[PDB]
Every structure is written in structure tokens, then in C-alpha cells.
Amino acid sequence: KFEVLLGVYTNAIQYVRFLETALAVSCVNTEFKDLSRMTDGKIQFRISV
Amino acid sequence: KFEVLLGVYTNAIQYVRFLETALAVSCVNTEFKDLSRMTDGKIQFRISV
């Protein structure tokens, strides 16, 4: 008289990625990373309408 | 003047199988030849969140 283990299972965690989703349509990913290095967190624009 | 009998008919009991009907779409089957031997079955999920 036995006790069957009918199988054993785990789920695959899906790899979400920020550049795979379409939320990155509304964001441009700059490869500059100097605004983390910059002390003040401001950037000044000379716009001209 | 006689008593004719015009036929002796009967119904043919058509076989019905579980795997021939479409209820078997909802469950996957298995011929386990010694089921009365089994006292407890078990299946174990591991859901890493």
C-alpha cells in the first residue's frame, strides 16, 4: 500500500523588462549618467519661442 | 386464420467511452492499473512570488 506523489511543479517567473514594456515609449533612456554625477539636480535650458 | 408476427426487434446498446465523449477535454486521464493499492495521492506546487 503506497502513497503516490503525482508530480511536483513550480512556476516560471516571467522576466519583465522596462525596455520591453511600452511604458518606455514615453521615456528616452540617455546613456549620459552625469546628472547623477552632477552635484545640483538642475539643468538650465535657453529655450527660445 | 393465423396470428402473424411482423418482426421481433431490439435496440443496439451503443457503447459510450469516456475518451470518446467531449467531457474528456476538461481532464487528462491515466490508466493506473493498481489504484486500490494507493492510499493517498499528492501533487505539490511551489510558487516563488
Under a CB-based contact definition with an 8 Å cutoff, are residues A12 and B49 in contact? no
Q: B38: Cβ–Cβ under 8 A, 6 or more apart, which residues? A: A1, A2, A3, A4, B32
The label of the residue with cell 443496439 reads B12
The label of the residue with cell 514594456 reads A21
Min distance B14 CA to chain A CA atoms (Å): 34
Expressed in Å, this structure's resolution amounts to 3.8
Question: Quick one: closest CA in A to B38, which residue?
Answer: A2
HSE-CB for B46 with a 13 A CA cutoff: 5
Burial of A14 (0-12, 13-18, 19+ CB in 10 A): exposed
Under a CB-based contact definition with an 8 Å cutoff, are residues A26 and A18 in contact? no
DSSP string computed for B1-49 = -----------------TTTSGGGGSS-----S--TTEEEEEEEEE---
Using DSSP, state whether A26 is helix, strand or coil.
helix
Experimental method of this PDB entry: cryo-EM
Interchain proximity A9–B46, CB inside 8 Å = yes
